[PDB]
Write an enzyme that holds these catalytic residues in place. Structure first.
Site, short mmCIF file in Angstrom:
data_model
loop_
_atom_site.label_atom_id
_atom_site.label_comp_id
_atom_site.label_asym_id
_atom_site.label_seq_id
_atom_site.Cartn_x
_atom_site.Cartn_y
_atom_site.Cartn_z
N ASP A 351 0.84 -1.19 0.00
CA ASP A 351 0.00 0.00 0.00
C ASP A 351 0.88 1.25 0.00
O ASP A 351 2.07 1.19 0.30
CB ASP A 351 -0.91 -0.01 1.23
N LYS A 515 -8.91 31.01 -0.54
CA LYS A 515 -8.06 29.94 -1.06
C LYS A 515 -8.93 28.97 -1.86
O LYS A 515 -10.13 28.83 -1.59
CB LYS A 515 -7.33 29.20 0.06
N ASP A 703 -2.07 -0.97 5.92
CA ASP A 703 -2.44 -0.33 7.17
C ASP A 703 -3.92 -0.01 7.29
O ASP A 703 -4.34 0.49 8.34
CB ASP A 703 -1.62 0.96 7.36
N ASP A 707 -6.90 -2.97 2.75
CA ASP A 707 -5.80 -3.91 2.60
C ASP A 707 -6.07 -5.26 3.26
O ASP A 707 -5.26 -6.18 3.11
CB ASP A 707 -4.51 -3.31 3.16
N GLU A 908 26.21 -38.95 17.82
CA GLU A 908 25.27 -37.86 17.61
C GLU A 908 25.87 -36.50 17.97
O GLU A 908 25.52 -35.49 17.35
CB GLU A 908 24.00 -38.10 18.42
N1 LIG Z 1 -4.83 13.15 -3.42
C1 LIG Z 1 -5.20 14.30 -2.81
N2 LIG Z 1 -4.26 15.09 -2.26
C2 LIG Z 1 -4.65 16.22 -1.65
N3 LIG Z 1 -5.87 16.73 -1.50
C3 LIG Z 1 -6.80 15.94 -2.06
C4 LIG Z 1 -6.58 14.73 -2.72
N4 LIG Z 1 -7.78 14.19 -3.16
C5 LIG Z 1 -8.67 15.05 -2.76
N5 LIG Z 1 -8.16 16.12 -2.10
C6 LIG Z 1 -8.88 17.22 -1.55
O1 LIG Z 1 -10.06 16.66 -1.08
C7 LIG Z 1 -11.27 17.32 -1.65
C8 LIG Z 1 -12.15 16.20 -2.15
O2 LIG Z 1 -12.44 16.32 -3.57
P1 LIG Z 1 -12.74 14.94 -4.45
O3 LIG Z 1 -13.83 15.20 -5.57
O4 LIG Z 1 -12.90 13.73 -3.56
O5 LIG Z 1 -11.30 14.71 -5.18
P2 LIG Z 1 -10.66 15.24 -6.53
O6 LIG Z 1 -11.05 16.73 -6.61
O7 LIG Z 1 -9.17 15.03 -6.68
O8 LIG Z 1 -11.39 14.38 -7.65
P3 LIG Z 1 -11.11 12.89 -8.17
O9 LIG Z 1 -11.77 11.75 -7.27
O10 LIG Z 1 -9.71 12.53 -8.33
O11 LIG Z 1 -11.85 12.85 -9.58
C9 LIG Z 1 -10.78 18.40 -2.60
O12 LIG Z 1 -11.20 19.68 -2.11
C10 LIG Z 1 -10.04 20.44 -1.76
O13 LIG Z 1 -8.88 19.65 -1.99
C11 LIG Z 1 -9.26 18.37 -2.53
C12 LIG Z 1 -9.98 21.68 -2.65
N6 LIG Z 1 -9.81 21.56 -4.09
O14 LIG Z 1 -9.70 20.46 -4.60
O15 LIG Z 1 -9.78 22.57 -4.73
C13 LIG Z 1 -10.09 22.95 -2.18
C14 LIG Z 1 -10.26 23.28 -0.85
N7 LIG Z 1 -10.38 24.64 -0.41
O16 LIG Z 1 -10.53 24.82 0.79
O17 LIG Z 1 -10.32 25.53 -1.23
C15 LIG Z 1 -10.32 22.33 0.05
C16 LIG Z 1 -10.21 20.86 -0.27
N8 LIG Z 1 -10.31 19.86 0.88
O18 LIG Z 1 -10.46 20.28 2.01
O19 LIG Z 1 -10.22 18.68 0.64
MG LIG Z 2 -3.18 2.74 3.60
#
Ligand SMILES: Nc1ncnc2c1ncn2[C@@H]1O[C@H](COP(=O)(O)OP(=O)(O)OP(=O)(O)O)[C@H]2OC3(O[C@H]21)C([N+](=O)[O-])=CC(=[N+]([O-])O)C=C3[N+](=O)[O-]
Ligand SMILES: [Mg+2]
Ligand SMILES: C/C=C(/C)C(=O)O[C@H]1C(C)=C2[C@H]([C@@H]1OC(=O)CCCCCCC)[C@@](C)(OC(C)=O)C[C@H](OC(=O)CCC)[C@@]1(O)[C@H]2OC(=O)[C@@]1(C)O
Ligand SMILES: [Cl-]
Ligand SMILES: [K+]
Ligand SMILES: [Mg+2]
Length: 994
Positions: A351, A515, A703, A707, A908
């Protein structure tokens, strides 16, 4: 309703025919309960004494010894001897071994905790449903929830069933579905349909899966499935269905059992053919109840000569001390027999989130504006070290540590990161580690402003508990947070309204802190901040910003970029509607760009080197994750699975892509692909099964709950110490320190342990060979004297159990980790080794007969100078004139068995010295290289003297005689056997090559 994700809310309501406003009716709950059953995962019975013990007796060799113990009661019935009537206790001994060994197995089965029971901790007791009986919401027991029920969920609630979302009452609905996707990030759900019928759980953004908890929000949905039919029920089925195979070495012991039963069963009747000496032995008597017992006197004895009694004890203690040794490396081994299996691991599945990575979102890079002179636009880029939520690390510019407060832009960047944030950072004093409080994404910002420290706050002598939010509070006290505009899907951003709270009210001017996702925020920034100043946003500027953001979103590093801006002249507070969330995007207009941050779940510092070490040891490492494919690949590049610029095309697939391949192309796809992303929990188990189809010992590291199937299907399951309880329960080994290199250390220990196991295994088996040959010679020459079934037990249990255990402390091979993984199905004994043991077995086996024979023929203290007819000792009663000059009891003197046992024990001990190596001489391998070896020989010989120079133990066996005329002769074979094995060992070391 499995296809619930691909049908609209009205279609889902039409399937079960319930109005969204009103709940199901009691009749509907009755029928749906009689059709779909209750909403609960089935328990597992697990254990049964009456059947577990008999299962322990189902092995073949224990059936041989057990079949010999009753016969030993028959020999024990005999009043013939006784003086030796009291020595009737050998079967009980033979019995008390079995029982004892049995219990140990039961103890190994005692620790088998119910992993399904651990999975059942993720189902809540109560659930909230709307129904026809009452207008007001009904809090019932979640097991009584049937499909079609209207269910309500809120913050902190645990979802009881797989639910299609109908209406989300809050602005957003954030759900932590790490139970199925292994990601602590909370997904933002919706109510639109998902047309793909074969979508994975990660794509079903309109569903609420049972076991996951609501991070934030409140929503209403209709239940699709309950019980086993839920997505977690698939995990339960895959965890109860995957039976664990026998240890490879244990398979060796089993087939050895089969062939051993064949050879014993054929010898015992083979004696009947060589009955030329049984046609007419008595003067008139024949074969009656007294005569036939001989055919059993050998039998049980032959059995105890062939069965290596005490071998399970020796391997049990050896594996126990291996568990103790790896325990100092923070590796808690739950299953004893798994240690060996870890040595020959060919492939390691792993993982990412929580296993290879720290599962703690960290901001790697960030950038602000530098100079804006026309079309030119330079930026100030920074990198931040530290791979954890703990505020440890520093900010760097061009690989050089630099203080953040010197840049006016970074101060405002940290001000936006601190205020526009609902998360806090807590220090767990019980666990002694900083834990996130809120969403991982925003918590990364909290720890970020902790690392930056833009105001140069003294935090050195701060307590570790107050270190968590030291700088965040400093920024919070500078601007009072009036209200927060929460994240909405339409604008993909959030904002905060702040007033100075300065010495002079808010005359310095209120400011808005925003933001969000880059494009949506930059498109609303009419201004760009250059340190203190503000310049108009232009084409080339935003093209540079979007350029760097695109460079960070793809390629080697794949960061999650968030843009941060402010509003210098926000609108008045008395003209902002705070109920309508769609208006907020208009409130976040006319912004001033500040900077950009880049987040990523960073890898553990100990992983990359470990991957290089497995690569050096012929072990391939495979990443299997629920995270996105680009992220998993970008991590693979940092870990060493893929190169910094390696083209990964056919080497990384998603669960949806994996299922589209033909079954053949999947089975062969596991051989080349080293990264698997966006997979369901079933996919990991399927990949493990595929790798095991190539007869490769595979190990899985995880973890999370997702998994758990793989952890069971893999031959060796390794769970993280900071991981879920259900992952630890379905694993054979736990890493308390979460360090990934202790896996490499554990594999090294496993290989060394097996290399040491072949030694004492071959030792005990060879002793059994000599004993079998000896009982055969004594049986064909009519001399049951000089051996007894009782003594062969103690010899194979005590006098041989100690040196065998000492052989477990032999020094390991130097280049032990430069060799490829060991072959799975390979014999411990090869043709030349089999020839060596076949010769030495008959040699040392004939020694024991030659002890008694020499005591009778050539001896000055042996009155039985029979010279001839020694083989016909049973006629001494019926043909007394033949046997004059002696008594009829001298045939069973103490000296024959004392000398036979003596040459046996000494041969032995010397043979245990020969077991220190297979192809290395004793001149180049000093025996004192293992202090425990010479110590165990000293203690086994000391216990042998205790057998001789005492009163009880001789009564069972025989009495010891002097040494001036006895030990001088034991050296005819006790010492030259080392020379025999030394010549046999010298041949293959030189004659094999050339
Ligand atoms: N691998 C990752 N790494 C880091 N962060 C991740 C990851 N996957 C999801 N997130 C964050 O979690 C939130 C969930 O969105 P979600 O639709 O599940 O995922 P994705 O947007 O990547 O789409 P996907 O499933 O890949 O098609 C998003 O909102 C936000 O930042 C993103 C977001 N944004 O995507 O723009 C803006 C925000 N503010 O506050 O502006 C806050 C978030 N949040 O709190 O999660
Ligand atoms: Mg994990
Ligand atoms: C003499 C003692 C017993 C217990 C016995 O019969 O062991 C055999 C036996 C079952 C095997 C043989 C023994 O073969 C002989 O005994 C040689 C000829 C018969 C002599 C009898 C009269 C002189 C082992 C003992 O030969 C050696 C070591 O010389 C090694 C090995 O077993 C192992 O792999 C080692 C322990 C797991 C097995 O040939 C094994 O059979 C298999 O299927 C194997 C492949 O496993
Ligand atoms: Cl993906
Ligand atoms: K397992
Ligand atoms: Mg994503």
């Amino acid at each position: 309703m499995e296809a619930a994700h691909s049908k609209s809310t009205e279609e889902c309501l039409a399937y079960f025919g319930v109005s969204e406003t009103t709940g199901l009716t009691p009749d509907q709950v009755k029928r749906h309960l009689e059709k779909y059953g209750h909403n609960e995962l089935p328990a597992e019975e697990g254990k049964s004494l009456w059947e577990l013990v008999i299962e322990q007796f189902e092995d073949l060799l224990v059936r041989i010894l057990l079949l010999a113990a009753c016969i030993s009661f028959v020999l024990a019935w005999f009043e013939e001897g006784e003086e030796t009537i009291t020595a009737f206790v050998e079967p009980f001994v033979i019995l008390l071994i079995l029982i004892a060994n049995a219990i140990v197995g039961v103890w190994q089965e005692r620790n088998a905790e119910n992993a399904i029971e651990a999975l059942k901790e993720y189902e809540p007791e109560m659930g909230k449903v709307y129904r026809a009986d009452r207008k007001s919401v009904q809090r019932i027991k979640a097991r009584d929830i049937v499909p079609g029920d209207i269910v309500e969920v809120a913050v902190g609630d645990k979802v009881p069933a797989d639910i299609r979302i109908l209406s989300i009452k809050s602005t957003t609905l954030r759900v932590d579905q790490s139970i199925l996707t292994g990601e602590s990030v909370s997904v933002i759900k919706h109510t639109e349909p998902v047309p793909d019928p074969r979508a994975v759980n990660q794509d079903k953004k309109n569903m609420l899966f049972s076991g996951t908890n609501i991070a934030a929000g409140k929503a209403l949905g209709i239940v699709a499935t309950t019980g086993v039919s839920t997505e977690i029920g698939k995990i339960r089925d895959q965890m109860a269905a995957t039976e664990q195979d026998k240890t490879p070495l244990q398979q060796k012991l089993d087939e050895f059992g089969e062939q051993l039963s064949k050879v014993i069963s054929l010898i015992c009747v083979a004696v009947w053919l060589i009955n030329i000496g049984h046609f007419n032995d008595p003067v008139h008597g024949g074969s009656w109840i007294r005569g036939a017992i001989y055919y059993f006197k050998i039998a049980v004895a032959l059995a105890v000569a062939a069965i290596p009694e005490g071998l399970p004890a020796v391997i049990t203690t050896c594996l126990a001390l291996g568990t103790r040794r790896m325990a100092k490396k923070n590796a808690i081994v739950r299953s004893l027999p798994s240690v060996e299996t870890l040595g020959c691991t060919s492939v390691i599945c792993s993982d990412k989130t929580g296993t290879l990575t720290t599962n703690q979102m960290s901001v790697c890079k960030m950038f602000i504006i530098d100079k804006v002179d026309g079309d030119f636009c330079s930026l100030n880029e920074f990198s931040i070290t530290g791979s954890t939520y703990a505020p440890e690390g520093e900010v760097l510019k061009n690989d050089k540590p630099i203080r953040s407060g010197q840049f006016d832009g970074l101060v405002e960047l940290a001000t936006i990161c601190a205020l526009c944030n609902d998360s806090s950072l807590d220090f767990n004093e019980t666990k002694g580690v900083y834990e996130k409080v809120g969403e991982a994404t925003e918590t990364a910002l909290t720890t970020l402003v902790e690392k930056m420290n833009v105001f140069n706050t003294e935090v050195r002598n701060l307590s570790k508990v107050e270190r968590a939010n030291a700088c965040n509070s400093v920024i919070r006290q500078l601007m009072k947070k009036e209200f927060t505009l929460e994240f909405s899907r339409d604008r993909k951003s959030m904002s905060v309204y702040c007033s100075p709270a300065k010495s002079s009210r808010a005359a310095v001017g209120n400011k808005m802190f925003v933001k969000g996702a880059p494009e949506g925020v930059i498109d609303r920034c009419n201004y760009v901040r250059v340190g203190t100043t503000r310049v108009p946003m232009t084409g080339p500027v935003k093209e540079k910003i979007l350029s760097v953001i695109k460079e960070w979103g793809t390629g080697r590093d794949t960061l999650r970029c968030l843009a941060l801006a402010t509003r210098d002249t926000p609108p008045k507070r008395e003209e902002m509607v705070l109920d309508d969330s769609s208006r907020f995007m208009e409130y976040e207009t006319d912004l001033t760009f500040v900077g950009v941050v880049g987040m990523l779940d960073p890898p553990r510092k100990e992983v990359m080197g470990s991957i290089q070490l497995c690569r050096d040891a012929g072990i391939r490492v495979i990443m299997i994750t629920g995270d996105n494919k680009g992220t998993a690949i970008a991590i693979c590049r940092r870990i060493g699975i893929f190169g910094e610029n390696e083209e990964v095309a056919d080497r990384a697939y998603t669960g949806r892509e994996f299922d589209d391949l033909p079954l053949a192309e999947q089975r062969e796809a596991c051989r080349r692909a080293c990264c698997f992303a966006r997979v369901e929990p079933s996919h990991k188990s399927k990949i493990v099964e595929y790798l095991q189809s190539y007869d490769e010992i595979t190990a899985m590291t995880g973890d999370g709950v997702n998994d758990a199937p793989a952890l069971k299907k893999a031959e060796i399951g390794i769970a993280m110490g900071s991981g879920t309880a259900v992952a630890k329960t379905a694993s054979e080994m736990v890493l308390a320190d979460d360090n990934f290199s202790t896996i490499v250390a554990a594999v090294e220990e496993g290989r060394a342990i097996y290399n040491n196991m072949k030694q004492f295994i071959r030792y005990l088996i060879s002793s059994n060979v000599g004993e079998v040959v000896c009982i055969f010679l004594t049986a064909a020459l009519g001399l049951p004297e000089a051996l007894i079934p009782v003594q062969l037990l103690w010899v194979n249990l005590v006098t041989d159990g100690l040196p065998a255990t000492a052989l477990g402390f032999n020094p390991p091979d130097l280049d032990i980790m430069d060799r490829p993984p060991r072959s799975p199905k390979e014999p411990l004994i090869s043709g030349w080794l089999f020839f060596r043991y076949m010769a030495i077995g008959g040699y040392v086996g004939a020694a024991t007969v030659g002890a008694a024979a020499w005591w009778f023929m050539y001896a000055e203290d042996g009155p039985g100078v029979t010279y001839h007819q020694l083989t016909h000792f049973m006629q001494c009663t019926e043909d007394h004139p033949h046997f004059e000059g002696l008594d009829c009891e001298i045939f069973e003197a103490p000296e024959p068995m004392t000398m036979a046992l003596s040459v046996l024990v000494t041969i032995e001990m010397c043979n245990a010295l020969n077991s220190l190596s297979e192809n290395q001489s004793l001149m180049r391998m000093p025996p004192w290289v293992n202090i425990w070896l010479l110590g165990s020989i000293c203690l086994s010989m000391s216990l042998h003297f205790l057998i001789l120079y005492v009163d009880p133990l001789p009564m069972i066996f025989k009495l010891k005689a002097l040494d001036l005329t006895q030990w001088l002769m034991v050296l005819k074979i006790s010492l030259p056997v080392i020379g025999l094995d030394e010549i046999l060992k010298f041949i293959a070391r030189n004659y094999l090559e050339g």
